[PDB]
Amino acid sequence: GAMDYSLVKALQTAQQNFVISDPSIPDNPIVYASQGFLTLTGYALSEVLGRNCRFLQGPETDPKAVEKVRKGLERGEDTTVVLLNYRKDGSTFWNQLFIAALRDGEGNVVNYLGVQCKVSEDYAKAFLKNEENEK
Ligand SMILES: Cc1cc2nc3c(=O)[nH]c(=O)nc-3n(C[C@H](O)[C@H](O)[C@H](O)COP(=O)(O)O)c2cc1C
Ligand SMILES: [Cl-]
Ligand SMILES: [Mg+2]
Ligand SMILES: [Mg+2]
Numbered sequence: 001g002a003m004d005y006s007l008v009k010a011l012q013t014a015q016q017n018f019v020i021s022d023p024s025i026p027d028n029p030i031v032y033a034s035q036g037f038l039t040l041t042g043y044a045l046s047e048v049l050g051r052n053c054r055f056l057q058g059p060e061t062d063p064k065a066v067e068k069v070r071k072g073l074e075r076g077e078d079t080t081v082v083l084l085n086y087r088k089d090g091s092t093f094w095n096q097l098f099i100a101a102l103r104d105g106e107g108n109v110v111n112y113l114g115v116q117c118k119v120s121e122d123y124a125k126a127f128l129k130n131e132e133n134e135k
Contacts, residue, residue: 002032005102005115016114019053020102023109028054028073031111040118042088053114056085060092070097073112076101082119082127094124 002008002020011018017036021028029050041056048055057066065083072079078100085095096117101109116120119127 002096002111005111005113008032011115017118019048019114019116021053021112021114023112027113037116038089040093040116041085057083057094058086058090060084060093061086064097069097072099073101076109081122082131094119094121096127 003012005020006020008020012034015036016034017040018034019030019037020032024029025031030048030053031050033043033045033048038048039048041048054066061084065081067079069079071077078098080098082094082096084092086092096119098115098117100113102111102113104110
């Protein structure tokens with residue numbers, strides 16, 4: 001199960017915000033989210049299980065950030081981005097996402113793991129400027 005991964009246990013010891021998705025199910029829904037993620041976003045565990053985590057995005061989310069994630073997942077690459085997300089009540093926050101594939105012995109992706117960090121406006125600005133300049 002989700003909490004059987006040693007890196008998941010490690011993240012829990014530090015109370016990180018993370019989710020686990022299941023890409024064997026159509027549209028790669030969330031199948032676990034940590035308490036920090038639920039408090040951050042305003043959703044109960046049962047309500048987020050079964051949703052693709054794109055439910056956190058909205059009209060002011062930059063589609064280029066989303067596309068970078070999409071392509072990373074497609075290309076088998078670790079991906080790190082900052083993008084605007086939305087709580088259940090419509091309020092917004094900047095979210096730094098760290099996404100990786102969890103793989104079996106033959107390389108098959110068995111789950112994805114995504115760590116989330118709420119960051120300040122100032123930090124999001126600095127990060128996105130660096131990302132751009134580095135491009
Ligand atoms: C493990 C995992 C965790 C994710 N965490 C979130 C997140 O907190 N917020 C968000 O906007 N997208 C997150 N995503 C990204 C969306 O689920 C989706 O991959 C992204 O929108 C790109 O796919 P799409 O272009 O089909 O929407 C996560 C994705 C994965 C695989
Ligand atoms: Cl996805
Ligand atoms: Mg329902
Ligand atoms: Mg559900």
